[PDB]
Write a protein that binds this ligand. Structure first.
Ligand code: NAG
Ligand code: NAG
Lengths: 303, 303
């Protein structure tokens, strides 16, 4: 089967975008590897909508208005690894997705609660966009990300009121930027013991209670800007590899001299490679230079 | 350089999406081949915005608010073959796009005119999305597509009042659906002598002039639905390869018996593989059976 009317496709790639297609076209070669059918008018996925696309690797469904997805919709998709279904009217993480899947974009939707065994099948995940969704911490559910060894996860722009606890432990990155988070407590970041990044920018963090940032032996970048913070978060010096913390647009008033570098020189340590602080009530002349001894360049200090 | 904060990226693929970045991020490994940075807040492209991404193959800038693109902006892109910058505030077709480029999606923009030497450079195009722009026929300019052997071309959803005549002759597909096109006259499709499809759906074609559809020896699919037509366009039977004509939602009143099949049915000829007629003032009972002799099934006759 060559390709649907508006579409143009070449060598197993099928490009069907901005045609405003009522649903997934019926003429689609099985040879087909990518199906980019973005910004059309699909409102559901039907059992046999994707029938016999077993060689389909990446399906881009973004910018549609999907809202119902038939159970055995994805089941013919044996080799599928990429499923981008951002900016849709989805109302539940779709089930039965292809164990082959490694990336899952599902931003700007309408998912209010993520149940339990939803991700139970996948065993290759590692990327998961779920922001732009309206979920409150009470929407997650005991063992939602149960058995799911994945390294990236972003739940930005949602209705998070505090950092979730039962996420994947394997997580190498964790984002939660753009929420309504209240404050990072002691055992929040507990089990996330392998993180490189940790965005919490644009939140409402008022009081990060010390030692909580301790369980992140390897944390490398910490964005903690645009909050309601009042002093530099306690634990910063003890983080052997924190190379860029981000604190601008907070409500830091005072900057202790040992608020970043540690008291007695080490080497397990790393020199900061970026520190933000501008746009905080505390002028340049209130913070002794001795304060940024272990940063490298001057240029590393937005201030 | 490992990748920008919100971004995840693996094996030369940099995924920066929905982070709402103010601009194209600075830390981008030259090893990078896909640069997906969709739905952010990019407002312009700066000289050195992309410096040293010579292995960048496809760049995805869709759903951002771009409005100024520096001249030398794309020059660092020796091997770039896909550029999708649809859904942006662009005000003119960007110049000095990489000669390597094969596909250019520039939909939903604000480009009011396309001047002459714009595509002069490229020699590998074949896919151009320019719909969702506001351009009248007066907006094009003599020799705009000058020297541009390309095979696809979709100017949907614009302000076309008639079919443009100085498009690429090498054209295989050509879409002009959703316009305000008035009528397809004699020499309109003159030089497009190599088309397989020709969408003119959703227009205001009142009167397609005979012979005009004669210049398309190979035309295989012709949507011509959603217009002000009043009788089946003259010439249909003479198109040796027309397999699917769409006529629905028009204003076709009478259907001559030899409007579809030719008068002296050969052996070498073609069967229609689909004809639409539904939603037109003319009941199934006014149109003689002898009329669809050469169609194949009954089911190829939405009617
Ligand atoms: C900043 O003012 C103080 C720091 O002295 C802090 O307690 C408070 O949360 C901030 N004010 C508001 C409501 O933004
Ligand atoms: C269809 O009806 C008449 C038939 O002659 C035609 O003159 C006219 O253009 C059409 N009316 C509309 C606006 O549908």
């Amino acid at each position: 089967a060559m390709c649907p009317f508006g579409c143009h496709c070449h060598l197993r790639v099928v490009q069907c975008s901005d045609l405003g297609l009522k649903a997934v076209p019926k003429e689609i070669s099985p040879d087909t590897t990518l199906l980019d059918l973005q910004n059309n008018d699909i409102s559901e996925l039907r059992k046999d909508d994707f029938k016999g696309l077993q060689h389909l690797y990446a399906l881009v469904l973004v910018n549609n208005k999907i809202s119902k997805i038939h159970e055995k919709a994805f089941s013919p998709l044996r080799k599928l690894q990429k499923l981008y279904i951002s900016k849709n009217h989805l109302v539940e993480i779709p089930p039965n997705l292809p164990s082959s899947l490694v990336e899952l974009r599902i931003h700007d939707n309408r998912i209010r609660k993520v149940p339990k065994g939803v991700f139970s099948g996948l065993r290759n995940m590692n990327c998961i966009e779920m922001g732009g969704n309206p979920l409150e911490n009470s929407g997650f559910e005991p063992g939602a990300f149960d058995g799911l060894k994945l390294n990236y996860l972003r739940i930005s722009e949602a209705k998070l009121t505090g950092i979730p606890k039962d996420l994947p432990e394997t997580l190498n990155e964790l984002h939660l930027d753009h929420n309504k988070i209240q404050a990072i407590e002691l055992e929040d970041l507990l089990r996330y013991s392998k993180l490189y990044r940790l965005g919490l920018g644009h939140n409402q963090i008022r009081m990060i209670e010390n030692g909580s940032l301790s369980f992140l032996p390897t944390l490398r970048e910490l964005h903690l800007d645009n909050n309601k913070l009042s002093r530099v978060p306690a634990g910063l010096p003890d983080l052997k590899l924190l190379q860029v913390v981000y604190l601008h647009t907070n409500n830091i008033t005072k900057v202790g001299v040992n608020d970043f570098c540690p008291v007695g020189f080490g080497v397990k340590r790393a020199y900061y490679n970026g520190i933000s602080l501008f746009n905080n009530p505390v002028p340049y002349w209130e913070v002794q230079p001795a304060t940024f001894r272990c940063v490298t360049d001057r240029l590393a200090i937005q201030f």
